Design an enzyme around this catalytic site. Structure first.
Site, PDB file in Angstrom:
ATOM      1  N   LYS A 155       0.821  -1.208   0.000  1.00  0.00           N
ATOM      2  CA  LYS A 155       0.000   0.000   0.000  1.00  0.00           C
ATOM      3  C   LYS A 155       0.860   1.265   0.000  1.00  0.00           C
ATOM      4  O   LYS A 155       1.940   1.295   0.590  1.00  0.00           O
ATOM      5  CB  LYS A 155      -0.918  -0.006   1.224  1.00  0.00           C
ATOM      6  CG  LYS A 155      -1.581  -1.358   1.502  1.00  0.00           C
ATOM      7  CD  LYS A 155      -2.467  -1.310   2.737  1.00  0.00           C
ATOM      8  CE  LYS A 155      -3.625  -0.337   2.541  1.00  0.00           C
ATOM      9  NZ  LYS A 155      -4.394  -0.103   3.792  1.00  0.00           N
ATOM     10  N   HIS A 158       2.204   6.909   2.370  1.00  0.00           N
ATOM     11  CA  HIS A 158       1.795   8.310   2.376  1.00  0.00           C
ATOM     12  C   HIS A 158       2.243   9.132   3.587  1.00  0.00           C
ATOM     13  O   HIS A 158       2.899   8.627   4.502  1.00  0.00           O
ATOM     14  CB  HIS A 158       0.276   8.389   2.223  1.00  0.00           C
ATOM     15  CG  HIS A 158      -0.478   7.621   3.262  1.00  0.00           C
ATOM     16  ND1 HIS A 158      -0.595   8.050   4.566  1.00  0.00           N
ATOM     17  CD2 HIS A 158      -1.161   6.456   3.186  1.00  0.00           C
ATOM     18  CE1 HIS A 158      -1.320   7.183   5.250  1.00  0.00           C
ATOM     19  NE2 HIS A 158      -1.676   6.207   4.436  1.00  0.00           N
ATOM     20  N   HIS A 161       2.435   7.800   7.155  1.00  0.00           N
ATOM     21  CA  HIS A 161       3.482   6.904   7.639  1.00  0.00           C
ATOM     22  C   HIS A 161       4.768   7.631   8.010  1.00  0.00           C
ATOM     23  O   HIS A 161       5.782   7.008   8.331  1.00  0.00           O
ATOM     24  CB  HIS A 161       3.759   5.825   6.593  1.00  0.00           C
ATOM     25  CG  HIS A 161       2.555   5.004   6.263  1.00  0.00           C
ATOM     26  ND1 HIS A 161       1.635   5.387   5.311  1.00  0.00           N
ATOM     27  CD2 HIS A 161       2.068   3.875   6.827  1.00  0.00           C
ATOM     28  CE1 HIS A 161       0.629   4.528   5.307  1.00  0.00           C
ATOM     29  NE2 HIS A 161       0.866   3.603   6.219  1.00  0.00           N
TER      30      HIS A 161
END
EC number: 6.1.1.19
Length: 606
Positions: A155, A158, A161
């Site tokens: 995933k 972005h 994180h």
RNA sequence: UUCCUCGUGGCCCAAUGGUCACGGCGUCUGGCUCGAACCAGAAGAUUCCAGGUUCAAGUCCUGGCGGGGAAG
């Protein structure tokens, strides 16, 4: 004996008890030296055991109330009247060369350090130990494992994180500075339906050549589309034929053995880790080991299952292995550890991973830097290790944090972290060009811009306590005026310019400057400020808050900047010029230390 | 519906239970003839509500409200 002697008596003085004295480090913390002094003296005056006084000494809110103070009520002196005692003990208190003044105030007694005394000891100490100034040996041969970031490689990485990453980076650096051996571990979420979804998605929309043009752009396009499918076809298509189920299937093939899947997977796995290594490095982070859900075998997992039963922690429920933690805590509830089909769940994998780690490292402490959204999970996880009887269970800790809101792939609001950085770098690059004369003197405007922007991004996140949530806003990453990363960078950058501006004098001469020439209020406030970094770091390791450091860093830089407008190094007598160069010098060193601790990268020019 | 967490000046936010709450932003007044990505000064508070514990509460306790999260 005399003053240089009192210091020795005070450095080899454990007025603190076997518990708190492990906090007293007169040798590398000027405030501790004072704590010792004040304690020893106030004891002689009050009659109260010094071990009782020491921990009652509090650092002040603002520098106007002193450097330390003590709430008389805290000493619990039967039938006494604090306000009177304060006055009594205060008017009789021996200042010597240590204290500037002691003043009773309400039920408190304030202590104002002698800036001169501080100056003579702190600046040289700072100028000599440099990168080790804030340091202090709080632990004797201890090893700690800090697991941070640990993203799901399937995933988008972005802005959200950014948190678990820099926080963990911080704790890592902080722990090292205080005497720990640190294992920086990234526990990669790389084994499950999620990756399956990405794999399946690559069959559906993937294009081997576009993948090469830009793996990430293409892969994201893949992620996006394949995810629209699961959403669009909600509960229609029957599992076996639906996208979701098709994803679960792909994971089956892997967890099953399909040498064909375990190849496309390993290919991704290697690539992603490479892409990550750069990103973490761009944030001054280097992991020791890139573990992951995959790295924990069914051996370790099942061995754990047996332990749950072996300890009578599980109960059967229509073929599923469960654990009702209620007995231990009503709020914990029941947890599925293994389902009917035999598949052990993630709660069990975590326990495996844990045990595996204790075996391989025999750590003295392990810190889990996860998000508050895993509070319940983290709690259950910990509880279980407890009831399993592991001695080390008590050495596990969860450091959480609030979430960055405004990140959604299905909402199109998503923005990768690599881009956040890049976009900020460019913006910072433009403000950097606004000043030709200066700009010209920079060798790598691009490299510097990126360093400036990163400080911007990191600080704006570390400013408040971990637990706090915050709305993603470009203006938060793009601001350079006021308390922002750029502010710290500019302070560091201009203190260097002042240094370069006076090459005529060198550090060796600074350490032996006539510190008495640093008598101005502004210089005093700044000096006192300098001697607090050591306390700051130790407090930082108690709160595990980057903000503990950032807050200090601004008080420091604020004071520096005030001084900057009144205490010139240039156009002065060599004597005064060396004095202030030692003051700004130390100041820069401390700011340097703190910034690095936080994970930023000081810049010489911007 | 149950649990956790946050609530501080117009906006963001700090705080060892320890006095009269730290900063930034916005805004007002000034300062560019060793870096103005700066500085000096001004205004802006009852720290969400009702109580409670305590010598002392922004900080601890209960409940409400609101935002967020989690569980069911």
């Amino acid at each position: 004996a005399s003053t240089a002697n009192m210091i020795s008596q005070l450095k080899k003085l454990s007025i603190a008890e076997p518990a708190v004295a492990k906090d007293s480090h007169p040798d590398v913390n000027i405030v501790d030296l004072m704590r010792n002094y004040i304690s020893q003296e106030l004891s002689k005056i009050s009659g109260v055991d010094s071990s009782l006084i020491f921990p009652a000494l509090e650092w002040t809110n603002t520098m106007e109330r002193g450097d330390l103070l003590i709430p008389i009520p805290r000493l619990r002196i039967k039938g006494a009247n604090p306000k009177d005692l304060a006055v009594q003990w205060a008017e009789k208190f021996p200042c010597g060369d240590f204290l500037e003044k002691v003043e009773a105030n309400g039920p408190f007694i304030q202590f104002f350090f002698n800036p001169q005394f501080l100056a003579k000891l702190v600046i040289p100490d700072i100028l000599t130990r440099k990168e080790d100034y804030g340091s202090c040996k709080l632990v004797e041969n201890k090893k700690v494992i800090i697991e941070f970031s640990s993203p799901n490689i399937a995933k988008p990485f972005h802005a959200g994180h950014l948190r678990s990453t820099i926080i963990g980076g911080f704790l890592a650096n902080l722990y090292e500075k205080l005497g720990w051996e640190v294992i920086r571990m990234n526990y990669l979420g790389d084994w499950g339906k999620q990756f399956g979804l990405l794999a399946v998605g690559f069959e559906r929309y993937g294009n081997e050549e576009a993948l090469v043009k830009d793996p990430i752009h293409h892969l994201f396009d893949v992620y996006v589309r394949i995810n629209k499918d699961i959403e669009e076809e909600g509960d229609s298509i029957p599992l076996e034929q639906s996208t979701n189920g098709k994803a679960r299937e792909y994971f089956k093939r892997m967890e099953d053995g399909d040498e064909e899947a375990l190849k496309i997977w390993k290919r991704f796995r290697e690539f992603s880790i490479e892409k990550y290594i750069d990103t973490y490095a761009r944030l001054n982070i280097k992991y020791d080991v890139y573990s992951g859900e995959s790295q924990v075998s069914k051996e370790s997992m099942l061995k754990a299952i047996d332990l749950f039963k072996e300890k009578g922690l599980t109960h059967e429920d229509k073929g599923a292995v469960l654990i009702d933690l209620t007995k231990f805590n009503k709020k914990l509830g029941k947890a599925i550890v293994q389902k009917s089909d035999g598949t052990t769940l993630y709660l069990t994998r975590d326990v495996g991973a844990a045990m595996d780690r204790y075996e391989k490292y025999h750590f003295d402490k392990m810190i889990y830097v996860i998000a508050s959204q895993q509070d319940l999970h983290a709690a259950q996880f910990f509880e279980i290790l407890k009831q399993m009887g592991f001695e080390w269970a008590k050495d596990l800790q969860h450091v959480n944090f609030g979430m960055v809101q405004g990140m959604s792939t299905r909402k199109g609001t998503v923005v990768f972290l690599d881009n956040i950085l890049e976009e900020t770098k460019e913006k910072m690059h433009e403000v950097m060009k606004k000043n030709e004369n200066k700009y010209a003197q920079i060798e790598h405007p691009e490299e510097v811009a990126d360093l400036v922007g990163i400080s911007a991004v990191m600080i704006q996140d570390m400013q408040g306590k971990r637990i706090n949530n915050y709305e993603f806003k470009w203006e938060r990453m793009l601001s350079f005026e006021g308390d922002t990363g750029p502010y710290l960078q500019y302070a560091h950058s201009r203190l260097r310019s002042v240094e370069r501006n006076a090459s005529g004098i060198t550090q060796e001469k600074w350490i032996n400057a006539d510190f008495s020439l640093l008598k101005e209020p502004a210089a005093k406030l700044l000096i006192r400020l300098l001697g607090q970094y050591p306390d700051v770091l130790r407090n930082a390791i108690k709160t595990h808050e980057p903000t503990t450091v950032v807050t200090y860093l601004f008080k420091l830089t604020h004071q520096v900047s005030s001084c900057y407008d009144v205490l010139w190094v240039a156009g002065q007598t060599e004597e005064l010029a060396t004095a202030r160069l030692a003051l700004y010098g130390a100041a820069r060193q401390v700011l340097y230390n703190g910034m690095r601790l936080l994970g930023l990268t000081p810049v010489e020019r911007m």
